[PDB]
């Protein structure tokens, strides 16, 4: 999309969303630690059913 | 005391098209946000665009 | 006994309900917000009554 002010924010949000799921290849280092934080969030995910099963 | 503008030769960075007549940039941004809102289904981007419409 | 004037009035009304204005878009490979300043300036100094009257 073209650039105004709000649509700039929406395009930045779409940028971050596309980078964070690994679909895009980051070029600018901002996207680089965006992907880094996405990977950190992915590695720190766990579901209650798995934990209960492991406890059993 | 006369100020002389200094414009670099990197000036023709945008081309000309034809669109609806708007009295200000804010009106154009509002129209673009409304146009995007009319095609986005009621998910998370719909909420984003509604908040962006209340923005401007 | 005029019979052409209603047609002229209808055509003028039809063209009046559909305003057309310039729209600057960034060139290919240019920054996505390359045309924001120029568009803002154009909307600033073309919103007056003289421009609309001249176009009409």
Curated annotation (Swiss-Prot), chain B:
Transmembrane segments: none annotated. It is found in: Virion. Homododecamer. Interacts with the terminase large subunit; this interaction allows the packaging of viral DNA. Interacts (via C-terminus) with the head-to-tail adapter protein gp4; this interaction participates in the head completion. Interacts with the scaffolding protein; this interaction initiates procapsid assembly, thereby ensuring incorporation of only one portal ring per capsid. Interacts with the capsid protein. Belongs to the p22likevirus portal protein family. Forms the portal vertex of the capsid. This portal plays critical roles in head assembly, genome packaging, neck/tail attachment, and genome ejection. Procapsid assembly may initiate with a nucleation complex composed of portal and scaffolding proteins. The portal protein multimerizes as a single ring-shaped homododecamer arranged around a central channel. Switches upon genome packaging from an asymmetrical conformation in the procapsid (PC-portal) to a symmetrical ring in the mature capsid (MV-portal). This change of conformation may serve as a signal for headful packaging. This is Portal protein. It comes from Salmonella phage P22. The gene is 1.
């Amino acid at each position: 999309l073209l650039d105004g002010k709000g649509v700039e924010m929406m395009r930045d949000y779409a940028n971050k969303q596309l980078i964070q799921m690994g679909v895009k290849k980051p070029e600018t280092p901002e996207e680089q630690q965006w992907l880094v934080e996405a990977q950190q969030a992915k590695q720190g995910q766990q579901d209650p059913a798995m934990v209960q099963a492991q406890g059993v | 005391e006369k100020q002389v503008l200094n414009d670099i030769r990197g000036r023709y960075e945008c081309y000309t098209d034809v669109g609806p007549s708007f009295q200000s940039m804010k009106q154009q941004n509002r129209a673009e946000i409304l146009e995007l809102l009319g095609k986005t289904p009621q998910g998370t981007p719909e909420y984003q665009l509604l908040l962006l419409q209340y923005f401007t | 006994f005029d019979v052409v004037r209603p047609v002229v009035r209808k055509l003028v009304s039809e063209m009046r309900q559909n305003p057309i204005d310039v729209l600057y878009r960034p060139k290919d490979g240019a920054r996505p917000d390359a045309a924001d300043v120029l568009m803002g300036m154009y909307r600033t100094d073309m919103r007056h009554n003289t421009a609309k009257i001249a176009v009409n």
